Design a binder for these strands. Structure first.
Length: 127
RNA sequence: CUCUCU
């Protein structure tokens, strides 16, 4: 998006101490951060005893605007009370929605399920 | 005294 004339240069987030519990979080961060800009790719971990998510954007100017608007406060019904801040990494790396993370320019990711191919993989035996 | 090498 980047539809604002002001500065911005940190395209990825810590998103800590959310209202949240599991990987629905990431698609919900997508659904509420889409209101600011072009959210990209997400992690979801229990940070030892806290909860956290970890998200990259397209546009650091929209991500500025969302840190502004969502680090400063929630949005409605006392129900969106995020801590949200820029990373030290500043280019987040997805793994798998197996236990950790998905990406939306990837398929869905998979979960590591992906099968053999009996032309080339099992082909020495195949059955 | 805070941020995933499934």
């Amino acid at each position: 998006d980047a539809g604002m004339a002001m500065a911005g240069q940190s395209p990825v987030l810590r998103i800590i101490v959310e209202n949240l519990f599991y990987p629905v979080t990431l698609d919900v961060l997508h659904q509420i951060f889409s209101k600011f800009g072009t959210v990209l790719k997400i992690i979801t971990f229990t940070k030892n005893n806290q909860f956290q998510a970890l998200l990259q954007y397209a546009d650091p100017v929209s991500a500025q605007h969302a840190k502004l608007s969502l680090d400063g406060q929630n949005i409605y019904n006392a129900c969106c009370t995020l801590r949200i801040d820029f990373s030290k990494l500043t280019s987040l790396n997805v793994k798998y929605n197996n236990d950790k993370s998905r990406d939306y320019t990837r398929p869905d990711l998979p979960s590591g399920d992906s099968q053999p191919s009996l032309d080339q993989t099992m082909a020495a035996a195949f059955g």
